[PDB]
Structures are given as C-alpha cells and as structure tokens.
C-alpha cells in the first residue's frame, strides 16, 4: 500500500520560512491523483493549504495564497511545501495526503495521509517565570500564577510538599508569544484561612528559578 | 478544407471529448485511441458515418446556449473518466444537466431549425450506476426523456444497474423543430452541425 | 465556503451517534468523513457521501441531503472515540468542517468546577493584568469558554487550553485573559463563561 | 375496490416542509391513472396541488410550483407530497386522490379519495388559554373568550354544568399567531342580569389548565 | 381560471334543486361534481357532464352548456344535504368551484341575532384587542360575514367559523377581528355585517 | 433509404399514431412498407378507405418525403389542440394522431370552414383527411356544437361529401394531389383536417 512521509525543520523563527517535503512510497507521483498539504494547529481543526498535480498545476487556499508555494519532483517521487513570512499562527502539525477524484462531480477524497510533522514558529528562548499569588475570595480556592516561562517543565508544590491534598496544578497554556504559563490551585477549608500558612514553591530548572510565594487573603 | 481526424473517432469529435471553423468532410481512421471518454454507446453509428461521408460542407453552430438553463446545473456535471488538465470534465458539445439545490424541474425545450441547411443534432441519456446516484445527480427517482421531430418520436427510460451514457442523433430539416422533454438523465445538445449534401 | 459541525457529541457504548455537517447546497456535493485520534493522522471512514473504504467496519455509515450531511455510527465502541471531520470541495478549494469531538461515555457525567481569579495587585504593580479561569472535574472532556466584559463578548487577549485528563479520569482546562492594567480598570465587570453539555456555568470578578 | 390512505406529521413549523404519503391498496400505481394531491383549509374550498403518473411525469398548481414535489414509489405502491417553506396559509386537510381521464377531451375526474389528514402549520408548543369576559350590554348574550392556547381542544361549561339551556360553545379558530381561540356564549333573559351569577368553566387538558371566570354587566 | 357557484341554496323535501357552476368557455369543457358532508371526503356524484358513477341514485343528474354547468337533484331527501363542488380543467390545472351548501329544509326560516363585543378591559391591559362577533339562532345554516373599519372593508386579522348546529337545531357562527390596542384606537367605528338569506344584519362598536 | 416500419401500420404512421414506437432519425425515404400484422394500427377506432391500393402505391415509389402543408396555427376560428382522446395517449395524457388535426368548437361556436390548398410542389402529394362519427347526439354537440354537419372535399378528379353517422369511430380518406392541382375543404363539423402530407415519386 501507498505511504506518505513528511520531513523538514521542526523549529522556525518568526518571518522565516517553513520548508517541508513529502516522500511517496508504494506508488508513483505520476498518476491521476492530486497531492495535497493540510495543517492542524494544536487543539484546532484541519486547514487545507493547497495541492499539486504531477504536471505542475497547483491550487491554493486563497487565505494562504500570497505566502505559499507547492512544488513537485517527479524523478524523486516527492512534492514539497514552502510557507514564508511565518508567525506563531503558523505553528501546527503539517500533513501531506493523496487526493483521488470522484467518479462523478467535483472534489475528491484524502487517502492515505502522512504521519504529520510538527512545525513550531517561535523566537522564544530560555526564560524564567514570574510568580504571582492568587488570593482567595465551607471551602476556598487559592493559588499561584506562574507566568511567561520557557521551556517546560515547571514544577509547583505547596508548603514544600507537606500539602498535597486538594492541590491541582493545571497543564500549561502555550501563548502566541511562544512562552508557557500555568496555574496551581489548592482548595482548603474556608476557616483555615488566616490560621494556616500557604506557600507555593515554583521551580524552573532551565532558568534556575526557585520562587516561594505566600498566598494570603 | 476536409477534416482528417487523428487519434479521435467521429463520435468523439462530434460530442467534443476533452481528450481530443468550417470543414468539407470528416474521416476517422483507424481504431481510435479516444472514442467516448465516459463509458457508453453511440447509436446508429455506422449509419451516421455513411451519411457524413457524403456531405460537401460541415459547420458547427450553437443551438441551445449553456447559459439558458437557469433551473438546472449545466457545468458541475463532470466525470473523472473525461479529464481535462488533471480534473474532471465532460464532452464540450453536449450538456450534463444535473439538479440544482436538490431540485430538477421538468424540462420542456424546443429548437426550430430556421437555417437553410439540414442540422445534425445529438443528445444522450445517462444510465446511472445505482439508485443513490440517480437521486444524487437528478433528484427525481423516476425519470424519462422525450424527443420529437415531425419525423421522430423517441421516449427513453434510464436503466439503473456500471454507469453508462447512450447517445442518439437525428437530422433536423429546415423549418422543422426538435422538442425535448425530461425530468432527469438528459444529456442536452448545446451545439449542432449544419451539413450540406 | 464553510462547513459547520457541532463541537461535541456523546454516546453510550453500543448506542448510535449522529455527527452532522451543514453548508449551502451541501446535498449537491459529495462529502467525505475523517476520524482522528489524538496524536494520529486523519483516517477516511466515509467517502462520496456513503461509501466505506476497505477495512472500515460496517457500523459506520453516511448520508447527505438538503444542506446537511450526517456521519452515523451504530453499536458505538470505545475505540470510536475520536474527532470527526467532514470535507467537501467548493470553487477551486477543499474545505474541512470545524470538527466534532465524539465521546463514548465510560463514566458518569460530571459538571465543571470553575474558579476565576482577578489580576493580583503584584501583577498590576508589574504593569500587567491577567484574569485566570480554571476548569476542573468535568466529563465528558469537551468544554466551550467565553469571556464577557461589561456583558459584552471578548475575544482579543484570550488563550485557552485543550481539555486534559486528570488523575481521576475527569478533565481539566484553563483560560487566560491578558489585559493591560488600563484595560482592566476600564470595565466594571468581567466574566468567565463555561458551557458543558448544554449547561453554562459562570464566574464574575470586578475591578475594586 | 381501490383505497387511498394519507399519513404524515400533523404539525409542521413555519418555513418547514409538509411531508405526506399516500398508500394505495386494491390497485397498482402503475396503471393508466394519475395520482393527485388536493387540500382544503378548514371551512374553505378545495385546492388542487398537483399530480403524478407512474412514468414520473408531473403537473403542479402554478401558484405552488416552486415549493411542491410529488414522487412515486412503485415497490411500496405509494406516492408522496413534499410542500416546502410553509406558512400559516398552508394549514389544511390534505387529500390524496386517483384521477381518471375522459374518453374525449382534456381533464378528468377524482375517484376515489383518501380520508384526508389535517396538517397544522404553527410554531406553538403546549400553552394554556387566557380567558376574557364577554360582558353583556328582551334577552341578552354573554360569554367567555378563550384565547391563545395550544393545542386543541378546550372544553367549556357554565356554572359547573348547571347552566345548559341557551349555551353554545363555538369551534376554534387558528389565528395567524399559531394559537387557537374560541368563544362560548349563553343567551339569557335580560332581567336576570345582575341578580344571577354566570361563570364559565374552561378546561384545557393538554396544558392542564383550568380557569373559572365570572361574567357580569 | 375561476369556477363560480352560488354560496348556498335551499330546497323543500321532495322538490328539485339546481346547483350552478359558471366559468369562461365552460361549455367546451367536461365538468364533474362532488358531494361533501362535514368531516368526510368528497364523493363523486357526476362526471363527464352527465354520467353517474355506480351507486349514485338516479335522482342526481347534470348538464353543461354555454358558460354554465348545472347539478340537478330531484326528489331531494335529507341525506342529500351537503356541500357541492363542480370541477374542471384549464390549460395546465384542475380547478374546483367555490362550492355550494345545499340545505333540505326541515324547519322554518330563522333570522340571526348578532352580538358584537369590543375588546374587554382585561384584554386591552394585556396589550391585545379582539373584536368578537357572535351570530346565533339562524336557519338555514349559511351566512356571510363582513368586517369594516370606519366603513372600509377589513380582511387582515379576520377569522370566521363555519356555521355549527346548536342544541335547538338552529345554527350559530362566530367571527373575530384581532387587533393591537393601537390600531383598535386608530379608527372611530368598527362594524360586523352579517348576511343571511339576502338580508343584512349589522352591529357596530367604538373605542370610547 | 426505404422506410421499413416496425410495430406500426402504414395507416398508423401516415396519420401519426402516438402509440407507434419508432426511431426514425432520417427525414427522407425511398418507399414505405409495413410488416405483416402490425402491433399498432389506429389508436382511435375507425377505418381507412382504399387501404390496399394505398399500400400498393407506397411500396412501389422511388422517393417519399413528409411536409407540412397546413399549419395547425392557421385555424383561428376553431380549437385545433384540445380535441384529444384517451384512446390516443401521449405521456399519460389524452392526445391524437400527430399528422391530422381534430378541430372542435371554440367557445359556443364552430364556424363553417372553407380552406383550399394548392400543390405548389413539383411532386405528387399524398393528402389525408378524416371524418368523425360521434358516439351520440350529445357528443356531437359537445365537440362541434352544430347538430347537422358535413365535410366537402374536392379535387379535379374527386368529389366527396360526407355526413357523420351518429361506438364512436373515425373514417379516413386519401388522394394523390397532382402538381398545380388544388384540394378544397369545406366543413361545419366532424372534420379531421390535414396538417402534414407526403411528397411521393413517382
Ligand atoms: C440519528 O439519525 C437517525 C436517522 O435520522 C434520519 O437521517 C438523518 C441523516 C437526518 O436526515 C434525519 O433528519 C433523519 O430523520 C435517527 O433514526 C431516525 O430517528 C427518527 C426520529 O429522530 C425516527 O423517526 C426514524 O424512524 C429513525 N430512522 C432510523 C432509520 O433509525 C436516530 O434517531 C438518530 N439518533 C440520535 C441519537 O439522534
């Protein structure tokens, strides 16, 4: 059976150019199929980029048309994608796929698909987080905001690991800046506030950040 | 100047096979690579070739413009069996009428030959692959095509099976009209040919 | 050309689920459907409105009529839990639907706990303002978050995580609204709205 | 004998589609007859909708032509009606009928007919009635106006059924709003007004609403 | 194409009644007739101008000439009381006449009492205004209702019931003019005109 | 070149019986011959006068061509389209022979017809016409309005006058109209008029 395989740089600076190629196995580029690129930003839908025929003819998504180029190499049995002037919005898993035409009417279907390759557009480099208290408003929620760090991971404990029960450290969000942020929350009895001390311990090893923050009402 | 066909059959050239303005006569030889791009048959073929070998002049004219179908889709009916530039297409000289917004109103259309010459007119019927394709393309489950001339009365029912098209032709005399009526599966003429014996 | 899908549906094991896809005159177009599991490529389950590729179980079926195409999965199994996308073609372009997360119910429904924090005074002293909305303990793992400022919808400055499975097999998510200190004080009310299985939970803070 | 039987949803929301089928027994759809749809709004005349032949040939009422479709299913020996984009004007009893041609000239006659099926076009859902007095001005008429309820029926009595003579409860009208209205009237001696108390007892079971209203001068 | 009929005719038991149907060039067309009783389907009584279906009694006959077709019932019985419709075909369409109610007189003629109610104060406070025109104790069971506002005819907002039999065997009908309070107050006078057997009864109300 | 009929008789095809299923895509023929025991003869019940003589003539001719001599639209005082029968169906509805016209009354009237056609061709013309004998007196009035009617047809070689016998049938006639010879029709009812005729050689 036919298999497709993407390859190319996984990290690209902003305003740079994503450059990928798709190797075709078990089948020939010179055939009645169309060869397509599709991308998927993390946690989002599939977006069609464009397509090419062995003859060189192309069709592109009108929204990407100005900055996108697709080419084909028949002797090497591959086709390729060039996406220039990239920003954080261009961070996505990029797929190649084979497209077959319907027996009747317009359009067609995608099969098989490549395994996909993640391309990240970010200028971010090692950066330590800022740590802010999230003050509470028969239980109460309080926490720590760990903001703008890179790379992962960050670890958070409470009262140096003496407090585990009721602790939830949420997975981080990756902002469009290229930097991560996360929050840790501990749910405590409302009456304990003011008698009991709550301290979040934030650690980011890549920046040698060790920050303790007391959270009070 | 005589039309000497290469690689393409008379049938293929008359219908306008994508894979293929005045001429004296037309001759096809031999065992052409391209006959009918969409699978099918051309009725009374040998009889037509016999007729077409005796004509002094041959000229293509538009009798029913593609744009005149406002209630039907005249362009999106296409097949990968008839490709053009890598994508689906169809015969250039006849129209694959299909439903528009899931509706196919009954067609009643007449063309009267006011020329001074006989006209060769061609049309076809699509016999769909199965019942699902029938409703996909034409919406109407139960369909017919009626064709009439002062000398001709034809009524066709699509055989639903493997899909094929079946093409027919007649000579429309001057001052005689051809009348088409269909609620589906009609491959309509756009262009016809003035012929002179 | 747009193809609209419900963001999520859920179904009990063995039962039937419908995933719908709508668009103008969609019934004139051939529609295909893709199944996608986390970390894997899309997989074609239906093409040309109704056809099943080789190796695709008979319980997958599709139909298309009017303006709506439907992927139907009967006797749904656990392995059918996935994202599903419809696909069509319009005017020189291929179009994929917005996608539907299909959950095969393996545990009881659980409503989200929602906690909303205003910017801390310390962040405000650093000339930044972040509103933090934390969402936990919900099943199924699909949620829609909407921010309001003075009752009006807010889009700019919003970042939200994809739901992730907790240790108790329920799900969590977080949403951040990043503002300038000036923008924070410019409004009298802010709200984080979390919609889960047709029910909307709301938390509000105000700039004292 | 040939018998025809209509079936389909009895309630359709505005802009929706009336969808009916006619089952033919005692005869085959494939015959020399035409198969027809005719409708009758309540209390009004007959209107021809359209017709179909086993060959697929159809003819429709020109005023309905854009929104009507009639089809035939030979294997199930039935034919069907689809009327789209409906409004309040499309509320009617819908009949199917068999049409036979004259030996000479155009047209034909309808026989037999189906039993008819009422289709109501309303956006309404279950709703209780409002009850308003119809106050009197050698006899006088007084009553109750039972307004804006859904669906039918409503029953009305007077003085808990103790008052019958001179009482008439009218059939309901379906207002353009999609809600029903009816009136109940009792004709009484003029001198009895002000001495005798008149109370209408309204029952709307579908909404489980029960209303008692006194009507005085 | 129109087919016009008398709205109603009456006939003594044993006597003969004529129901007429008129329309342009009707004598060139074959005409059919249908009998319809309340709550029942139409029943063919005459087809192809003169022909009787099997089972239809011989006292039913029909004729057609000029622009007028006629259904004739001789020795009219109680069971003949029904609505009657003529039917023809013109150019693309089947057309039914406007219909005629035939009453076989079983009781003396009774004149309608008409009562017109203005909107009640309770309804007006509910932001609605309904004029209720009630017509009772009339025989035969055929009536025509017309609404006017400051003398000008009104169609929009009118609903009228077909006459229904009372407990005393006379007939009643009701008609409604539904208005908003604003339009109710916009005119100085409203009229309900009731025509029964060629005689018109009129009642009027005013927004005081 | 020769027209070999399948499923249909010479009478039926000449008159244009709708029930005839033929595919004839060429408008010129040498001669016309009907197979023995045709499936479709006359859709409306009736008779064809001098049939055997006509078939004999038509099988021995070198050229055969159909032309329109009297357009249906030229009858402004009579209804030329609505005269139809369920016995001659087309697409499920009543219809008639295609090559002759069933003229019927228009409004309450059927004016007397006086129509002549001169054969301006260079060939002999086969011309066909008919008379309708109605089922009863009622049908007579329904279709033609005039109780007492006739058809007159004349040629230099022919003088015909027909009165309808009033179970309904049609009766068809034909003549060969020589070049420069004219045929004269006169009728106040029951006239089945020619629309199409046939050029024959010799
Ligand atoms: C899932 O949908 C099926 C099928 O519904 C029909 O097909 C769709 C593609 C769409 O066109 C719908 O509007 C159609 O009604 C449902 O099965 C039908 O359910 C209806 C009531 O909803 C019932 O009247 C029919 O008889 C059913 N027919 C069949 C063949 O099952 C099914 O209920 C839907 N399931 C869920 C969970 O919504």
XYZ file of N, CA, C and O in Angstrom, chain F residues 31-143:
452
model
N -39.280 4.420 -50.133
C -40.650 3.916 -50.061
C -40.910 3.371 -48.676
O -39.981 3.193 -47.891
N -42.180 3.133 -48.368
C -42.563 2.709 -47.027
C -43.361 1.403 -47.075
O -44.292 1.248 -47.863
N -42.956 0.462 -46.228
C -43.536 -0.877 -46.168
C -43.803 -1.285 -44.722
O -42.952 -1.107 -43.845
N -45.002 -1.807 -44.477
C -45.401 -2.245 -43.146
C -45.296 -3.758 -43.014
O -45.681 -4.506 -43.919
N -44.717 -4.202 -41.905
C -44.656 -5.624 -41.595
C -46.058 -6.205 -41.379
O -46.971 -5.501 -40.937
N -46.225 -7.482 -41.718
C -47.497 -8.183 -41.544
C -47.945 -8.231 -40.083
O -47.141 -8.477 -39.180
N -49.243 -8.023 -39.874
C -49.855 -7.923 -38.545
C -49.210 -6.915 -37.589
O -48.708 -7.298 -36.532
N -49.225 -5.625 -37.958
C -48.624 -4.582 -37.120
C -49.255 -4.547 -35.734
O -50.449 -4.812 -35.603
N -48.467 -4.232 -34.715
C -48.988 -4.163 -33.358
C -49.950 -2.987 -33.191
O -51.013 -3.131 -32.584
N -49.573 -1.830 -33.740
C -50.385 -0.614 -33.672
C -50.907 -0.126 -35.014
O -50.124 0.215 -35.901
N -52.229 -0.075 -35.148
C -52.860 0.406 -36.370
C -53.453 1.796 -36.151
O -52.746 2.798 -36.289
N -54.723 1.862 -35.760
C -55.384 3.141 -35.498
C -55.708 3.287 -34.011
O -56.468 2.490 -33.471
N -55.148 4.304 -33.352
C -55.313 4.444 -31.902
C -56.760 4.773 -31.574
O -57.356 4.189 -30.655
N -57.327 5.700 -32.338
C -58.759 5.949 -32.262
C -59.458 4.982 -33.216
O -59.076 4.872 -34.379
N -60.484 4.274 -32.730
C -61.135 3.266 -33.568
C -61.694 3.839 -34.876
O -62.297 4.917 -34.887
N -61.475 3.123 -35.974
C -62.000 3.552 -37.251
C -61.547 2.759 -38.457
O -61.047 1.634 -38.344
N -61.707 3.369 -39.623
C -61.423 2.694 -40.873
C -60.605 3.573 -41.828
O -60.641 4.802 -41.761
N -59.842 2.925 -42.701
C -59.033 3.621 -43.690
C -59.460 3.185 -45.098
O -59.229 2.042 -45.501
N -60.098 4.084 -45.843
C -60.621 3.736 -47.163
C -59.526 3.516 -48.185
O -58.495 4.200 -48.159
N -59.753 2.545 -49.068
C -58.804 2.197 -50.125
C -57.411 1.927 -49.580
O -56.417 2.411 -50.126
N -57.346 1.150 -48.506
C -56.083 0.909 -47.815
C -55.111 0.107 -48.684
O -53.955 0.510 -48.867
N -55.594 -1.012 -49.224
C -54.774 -1.922 -50.019
C -54.167 -1.245 -51.239
O -53.023 -1.521 -51.600
N -54.942 -0.380 -51.885
C -54.454 0.390 -53.026
C -53.343 1.355 -52.617
O -52.372 1.540 -53.349
N -53.491 1.969 -51.447
C -52.510 2.933 -50.964
C -51.190 2.256 -50.631
O -50.122 2.761 -50.980
N -51.266 1.106 -49.968
C -50.068 0.361 -49.603
C -49.322 -0.080 -50.850
O -48.098 0.010 -50.910
N -50.077 -0.524 -51.850
C -49.521 -0.907 -53.145
C -48.778 0.244 -53.802
O -47.684 0.064 -54.325
N -49.377 1.428 -53.768
C -48.755 2.603 -54.358
C -47.482 2.981 -53.611
O -46.444 3.249 -54.219
N -47.565 2.950 -52.287
C -46.488 3.433 -51.433
C -45.279 2.506 -51.336
O -44.190 2.939 -50.955
N -45.454 1.241 -51.693
C -44.329 0.319 -51.672
C -43.590 0.332 -53.014
O -42.481 -0.195 -53.135
N -44.224 0.918 -54.025
C -43.657 0.946 -55.368
C -43.068 2.296 -55.778
O -42.688 2.480 -56.932
N -42.991 3.234 -54.838
C -42.496 4.580 -55.130
C -40.987 4.712 -54.880
O -40.433 4.045 -54.008
N -40.324 5.536 -55.687
C -38.879 5.751 -55.576
C -38.464 6.753 -54.484
O -37.357 6.666 -53.958
N -39.329 7.708 -54.153
C -38.996 8.699 -53.129
C -40.215 9.093 -52.306
O -41.318 9.225 -52.831
N -39.993 9.289 -51.012
C -41.061 9.547 -50.056
C -40.622 10.584 -49.013
O -39.643 10.373 -48.289
N -41.340 11.701 -48.930
C -40.931 12.799 -48.051
C -42.119 13.496 -47.405
O -43.087 13.823 -48.078
N -42.038 13.725 -46.101
C -43.116 14.364 -45.352
C -42.970 15.887 -45.299
O -41.891 16.393 -45.024
N -44.045 16.615 -45.594
C -44.029 18.074 -45.472
C -45.277 18.600 -44.769
O -46.306 17.943 -44.745
N -45.171 19.784 -44.182
C -46.311 20.441 -43.563
C -47.024 21.305 -44.600
O -46.437 22.252 -45.102
N -48.259 20.960 -44.969
C -48.994 21.802 -45.913
C -49.978 22.792 -45.268
O -50.241 23.859 -45.821
N -50.475 22.470 -44.075
C -51.444 23.329 -43.385
C -51.128 23.467 -41.886
O -51.495 22.605 -41.093
N -50.403 24.526 -41.499
C -50.060 24.650 -40.079
C -51.288 24.654 -39.167
O -52.330 25.215 -39.499
N -51.151 23.983 -38.030
C -52.216 23.868 -37.046
C -52.671 25.242 -36.549
O -53.840 25.443 -36.222
N -51.737 26.187 -36.521
C -51.996 27.528 -36.013
C -52.847 28.380 -36.955
O -53.337 29.445 -36.573
N -53.017 27.926 -38.190
C -53.762 28.713 -39.159
C -55.263 28.593 -38.915
O -56.052 29.300 -39.535
N -55.665 27.717 -37.997
C -57.081 27.644 -37.674
C -57.312 28.580 -36.494
O -57.083 28.216 -35.341
N -57.793 29.784 -36.790
C -58.020 30.782 -35.753
C -59.436 30.772 -35.183
O -59.676 31.284 -34.090
N -60.368 30.180 -35.921
C -61.768 30.195 -35.515
C -62.189 28.893 -34.837
O -63.306 28.783 -34.331
N -61.277 27.925 -34.798
C -61.579 26.596 -34.272
C -60.480 26.123 -33.322
O -59.335 26.570 -33.412
N -60.822 25.204 -32.426
C -59.838 24.685 -31.490
C -59.128 23.477 -32.103
O -59.745 22.445 -32.377
N -57.834 23.642 -32.361
C -57.042 22.643 -33.076
C -56.145 21.769 -32.193
O -55.428 20.906 -32.704
N -56.160 21.997 -30.883
C -55.245 21.289 -29.983
C -55.992 20.519 -28.913
O -55.539 19.458 -28.472
N -57.112 21.074 -28.467
C -57.837 20.475 -27.363
C -58.663 19.262 -27.789
O -59.108 18.502 -26.922
N -58.906 19.066 -29.086
C -59.581 17.824 -29.450
C -58.605 16.676 -29.243
O -57.721 16.484 -30.066
N -58.837 15.844 -28.224
C -57.919 14.754 -27.868
C -58.689 13.574 -27.310
O -59.835 13.717 -26.910
N -58.040 12.415 -27.260
C -58.689 11.197 -26.786
C -57.787 10.331 -25.913
O -56.575 10.204 -26.185
N -58.383 9.690 -24.907
C -57.624 8.806 -24.031
C -57.209 7.549 -24.788
O -56.277 6.878 -24.397
N -57.885 7.260 -25.893
C -57.505 6.152 -26.774
C -56.182 6.402 -27.524
O -55.572 5.458 -28.032
N -55.762 7.669 -27.626
C -54.505 8.026 -28.286
C -53.607 8.746 -27.296
O -53.414 9.959 -27.399
N -53.089 8.013 -26.307
C -52.379 8.695 -25.233
C -50.960 9.123 -25.624
O -50.322 8.536 -26.501
N -50.488 10.184 -24.988
C -49.083 10.572 -25.080
C -48.607 11.042 -23.716
O -49.179 11.980 -23.163
N -47.563 10.405 -23.180
C -47.055 10.723 -21.839
C -48.179 10.705 -20.811
O -48.286 11.619 -19.991
N -49.057 9.708 -20.899
C -50.084 9.541 -19.881
C -51.323 10.415 -20.034
O -52.287 10.271 -19.278
N -51.322 11.316 -21.008
C -52.475 12.185 -21.193
C -53.092 12.001 -22.589
O -52.468 11.435 -23.496
N -54.336 12.452 -22.735
C -55.062 12.301 -23.985
C -54.309 13.054 -25.085
O -53.720 14.116 -24.851
N -54.313 12.492 -26.285
C -53.605 13.113 -27.393
C -54.310 12.677 -28.673
O -55.478 12.264 -28.640
N -53.665 12.850 -29.815
C -54.309 12.472 -31.085
C -53.262 12.121 -32.134
O -52.063 12.275 -31.894
N -53.704 11.632 -33.281
C -52.822 11.485 -34.428
C -52.085 12.804 -34.650
O -52.704 13.878 -34.641
N -50.782 12.720 -34.885
C -49.934 13.905 -34.968
C -50.044 14.637 -36.302
O -49.687 15.823 -36.391
N -50.450 13.917 -37.352
C -50.362 14.480 -38.707
C -51.669 15.025 -39.253
O -51.710 15.602 -40.339
N -52.739 14.825 -38.493
C -54.044 15.377 -38.826
C -54.585 16.066 -37.582
O -54.114 15.818 -36.470
N -55.535 16.968 -37.773
C -55.968 17.840 -36.691
C -57.428 17.621 -36.304
O -58.331 17.673 -37.161
N -57.690 17.413 -35.018
C -59.082 17.243 -34.623
C -59.648 18.601 -34.253
O -59.620 19.004 -33.097
N -60.293 19.244 -35.217
C -60.844 20.567 -34.994
C -62.136 20.433 -34.210
O -62.977 19.586 -34.525
N -62.277 21.222 -33.157
C -63.508 21.209 -32.382
C -63.956 22.639 -32.141
O -63.247 23.580 -32.497
N -65.128 22.803 -31.536
C -65.709 24.126 -31.377
C -64.865 24.993 -30.447
O -64.145 24.488 -29.604
N -64.943 26.303 -30.644
C -64.232 27.270 -29.820
C -65.293 28.190 -29.240
O -66.065 28.814 -29.971
N -65.328 28.252 -27.919
C -66.444 28.822 -27.191
C -67.689 28.055 -27.633
O -67.634 26.860 -27.888
N -68.799 28.735 -27.816
C -70.002 28.011 -28.180
C -70.148 27.842 -29.690
O -71.221 27.495 -30.160
N -69.068 28.050 -30.440
C -69.180 28.158 -31.898
C -68.213 27.322 -32.749
O -67.051 27.142 -32.401
N -68.732 26.801 -33.861
C -67.941 26.141 -34.902
C -68.311 26.735 -36.266
O -69.200 26.219 -36.958
N -67.640 27.833 -36.650
C -67.890 28.476 -37.939
C -67.614 27.526 -39.090
O -66.796 26.611 -38.953
N -68.329 27.714 -40.193
C -68.108 26.920 -41.393
C -66.694 27.154 -41.930
O -66.241 28.288 -42.055
N -65.988 26.068 -42.210
C -64.637 26.136 -42.739
C -64.618 26.113 -44.252
O -65.220 25.238 -44.861
N -63.932 27.074 -44.861
C -63.615 26.962 -46.275
C -62.124 27.178 -46.451
O -61.616 28.287 -46.306
N -61.438 26.095 -46.788
C -59.992 26.106 -46.891
C -59.550 25.344 -48.124
O -60.042 24.248 -48.403
N -58.607 25.928 -48.849
C -58.054 25.306 -50.035
C -56.530 25.234 -49.951
O -55.888 26.150 -49.442
N -55.956 24.133 -50.431
C -54.504 24.021 -50.568
C -54.157 23.655 -52.002
O -54.710 22.701 -52.548
N -53.224 24.402 -52.595
C -52.741 24.148 -53.948
C -51.389 23.465 -53.863
O -50.534 23.883 -53.078
N -51.177 22.426 -54.664
C -49.920 21.703 -54.564
C -48.913 22.426 -55.416
O -48.854 22.266 -56.631
N -48.073 23.178 -54.720
C -47.063 24.017 -55.335
C -45.734 23.294 -55.409
O -44.730 23.862 -55.817
N -45.726 22.039 -54.985
C -44.520 21.248 -55.098
C -44.370 20.733 -56.516
O -45.256 20.922 -57.345
N -43.241 20.099 -56.802
C -43.011 19.528 -58.122
C -43.331 18.034 -58.104
O -43.133 17.330 -59.094
N -43.814 17.559 -56.961
C -44.127 16.150 -56.791
C -45.601 15.948 -56.469
O -46.267 16.840 -55.937
N -46.103 14.762 -56.781
C -47.433 14.379 -56.345
C -47.461 14.395 -54.828
O -46.472 14.034 -54.190
N -48.589 14.802 -54.251
C -48.754 14.805 -52.799
C -49.794 13.812 -52.349
O -50.920 13.798 -52.864
N -49.427 12.995 -51.373
C -50.403 12.163 -50.711
C -51.013 12.995 -49.604
O -50.300 13.452 -48.703
N -52.316 13.250 -49.710
C -53.033 14.045 -48.713
C -54.060 13.196 -47.986
O -54.792 12.453 -48.628
N -54.129 13.315 -46.658
C -55.057 12.510 -45.876
C -55.995 13.366 -45.035
O -55.606 14.387 -44.497
N -57.244 12.938 -44.914
C -58.163 13.640 -44.033
C -59.147 12.643 -43.467
O -59.145 11.472 -43.851
N -60.009 13.098 -42.573
C -60.934 12.175 -41.945
C -62.254 12.774 -41.512
O -62.447 13.991 -41.532
N -63.173 11.903 -41.125
C -64.431 12.350 -40.555
C -64.655 11.640 -39.234
O -64.321 10.463 -39.086
N -65.206 12.361 -38.266
C -65.540 11.747 -37.003
C -67.028 11.405 -36.942
O -67.882 12.285 -37.145
N -67.336 10.124 -36.714
C -68.710 9.686 -36.435
C -68.911 9.548 -34.933
O -68.504 8.541 -34.353
N -69.566 10.530 -34.303
C -69.632 10.519 -32.832
C -70.516 9.438 -32.185
O -71.411 8.844 -32.803
N -70.243 9.204 -30.901
C -70.927 8.184 -30.108
C -72.434 8.426 -30.040
O -73.235 7.494 -30.196
N -72.825 9.672 -29.795
C -74.250 10.018 -29.734
C -74.476 11.496 -30.031
O -73.521 12.231 -30.299
N -75.734 11.928 -29.971
C -76.089 13.313 -30.276
C -75.433 14.288 -29.288
O -75.004 15.385 -29.668
N -75.320 13.871 -28.029
C -74.726 14.717 -27.004
C -73.269 15.037 -27.331
O -72.833 16.183 -27.215
N -72.530 14.023 -27.769
C -71.128 14.187 -28.110
C -70.981 15.087 -29.330
O -70.036 15.876 -29.428
N -71.925 14.962 -30.254
C -71.944 15.798 -31.448
C -71.982 17.254 -31.023
O -71.197 18.063 -31.491
N -72.897 17.586 -30.123
C -72.996 18.960 -29.688
C -71.778 19.357 -28.860
O -71.250 20.460 -29.024
N -71.286 18.438 -28.032
C -70.157 18.764 -27.161
C -68.946 19.180 -27.988
O -68.275 20.167 -27.682
N -68.648 18.417 -29.028
C -67.453 18.701 -29.808
C -67.631 19.789 -30.868
O -66.786 20.669 -30.985
